[PDB]
Amino acid sequence: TLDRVGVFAATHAAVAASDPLQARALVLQLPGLNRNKDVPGIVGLLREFLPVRGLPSGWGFVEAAAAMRDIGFFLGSLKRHGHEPAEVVPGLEPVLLDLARATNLPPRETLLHVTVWNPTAADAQRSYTGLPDEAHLLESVRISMAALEAAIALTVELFDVSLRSPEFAQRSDELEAYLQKMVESIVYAYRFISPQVFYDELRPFYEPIRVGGQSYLGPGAVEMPLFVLEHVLWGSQSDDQTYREFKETYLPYVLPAYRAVYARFSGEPALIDRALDEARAVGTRDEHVRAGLTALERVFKVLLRFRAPHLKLAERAYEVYAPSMLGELLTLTYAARSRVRAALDES
Numbered sequence: 359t360l361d362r363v364g365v366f367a368a369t370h371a372a373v374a375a376s377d378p379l380q381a382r383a384l385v386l387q388l389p390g391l392n393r394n395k396d397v398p399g400i401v402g403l404l405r406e407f408l409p410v411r412g413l414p415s416g417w418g419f420v421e422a423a424a425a426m427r428d429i430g431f432f433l434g435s436l437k438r439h440g441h442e443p444a445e446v447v448p449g450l451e452p453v454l455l456d457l458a459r460a461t462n463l464p465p466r467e468t469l470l471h472v473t474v475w476n477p478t479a480a481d482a483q484r485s486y487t488g489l490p491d492e493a494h495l496l497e498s499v500r501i502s503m504a505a506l507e508a509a510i511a512l513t514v515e516l517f518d519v520s521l522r523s524p525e526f527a528q529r530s531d532e533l534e535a536y537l538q539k540m541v542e543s544i545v546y547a548y549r550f551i552s553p554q555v556f557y558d559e560l561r562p563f564y565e566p567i568r569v570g571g572q573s574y575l576g577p578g579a580v581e582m583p584l585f586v587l588e589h590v591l592w593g594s595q596s597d598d599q600t601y602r603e604f605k606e607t608y609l610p611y612v613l614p615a616y617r618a619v620y621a622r623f624s625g626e627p628a629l630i631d632r633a634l635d636e637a638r639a640v641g642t643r644d645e646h647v648r649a650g651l652t653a654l655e656r657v658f659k660v661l662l663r664f665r666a667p668h669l670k671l672a673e674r675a676y677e678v679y680a681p682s683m684l685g686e687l688l689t690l691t692y693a694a695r696s697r698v699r700a701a702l703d704e705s
């Protein structure tokens with residue numbers, strides 16, 4: 359049914375299958391050293407595979423991204439025990455910067471590296487902690503990342519589809535179906551991830567580190583390119599300070615293609631702004647207009663079925679505090695949906 363997922367999943371699998379540093383058996387030893395808080399051992403283990411002669415000239419994106427993944431687990435690890443990886447590992451910084459250049463991504467590990475680009479097998483999956491809860495968190499992202507990428511494609515396609523077009527409602531219904539995966543992810547997370555374990559054992563691995571004279575954030579699901587999708591859909595012309603700063607903060611961590619999508623739509627009304635103008639130009643009693651707007655409201659419904667439960671998920675973990683950004687974004691989503699619902703009012 360969600361047949362657009364396959365191609366995105368296949369691109370992720372290419373990186374997951376790559377191990378140019380032949381680091382698999384070495385990275386698997388990291389959880390034990392983390393448990394032992396063995397900083398010298400962690401550095402020693404990294405130096406067993408860290409390139410010292412520059413990157414192999416034959417590497418492409420796949421190899422460079424795979425190398426960053428495997429070095430990357432040592433970065434959040436070292437910071438977890440209170441150390442800047444660049445300061446305690448001679449020659450590491452130049453490698454990170456070279457890998458950043460090769461991939462057009464930050465000079466550390468991102469959500470992509472630790473989830474969809476990380477192999478799934480027990481004898482291959484890289485992990486900070488080796489904990490089941492960490493594996494469950496990775497799975498929760500794997501459930502929806504490829505679907506979300508399809509959804510970004512669909513949103514961009516829907517942007518050029520007139521509300522007057524016969525496809526509008528059908529495309530919106532298809533977008534809704536892919537976005538349902540985000541809901542599935544939060545249901546999964548609620549079921550399988552212990553809030554105590556997340557907060558006490560996993561969260562400390564996700565601190566920022568300093569590379570190239572600036573701070574780079576840790577992997578988190580916050581880096582999923584959902585914010586790019588919603589920039590196009592409803593948010594591009596939002597003057598809300600917290601929201602704009604949120605998007606600009608996470609922009610460097612998403613794939614270059616989605617950074618390009620973001621830029622393309624920043625100088626234009628968002629999809630719903632255009633659709634609502636169209637509804638007003640035709641008249642909101644027109645059944646085809648109403649069909650389109652109703653379909654659009656369902657997209658907002660599914661976005662809220664992710665976002666509201668996610669806030670609860672986040673609150674439960676931090677009860678063991680969540681940033682204001684979450685509730686603020688939730689409210690903005692409600693406001694956007696309300697604009698659609700207002701057009702559908704029959705009085």
Ligand code: HEM
Nearest residue numbers: 498499543544547551556578579580582584665672675687
């Ligand atoms: C117990 C598990 C989780 C916790 C504790 C958690 C916590 C948070 C927090 C605190 C934020 C605000 C930004 C930050 O400080 O990093 C955030 C944002 C975000 N998270 Fe989660 N999260 C969890 C699971 C998930 C899952 C499973 C997904 C999707 C697969 C997800 C998707 C997102 C997204 C897309 C944002 C950006 C804000 C938004 O769209 O509303 N999170 N998360």
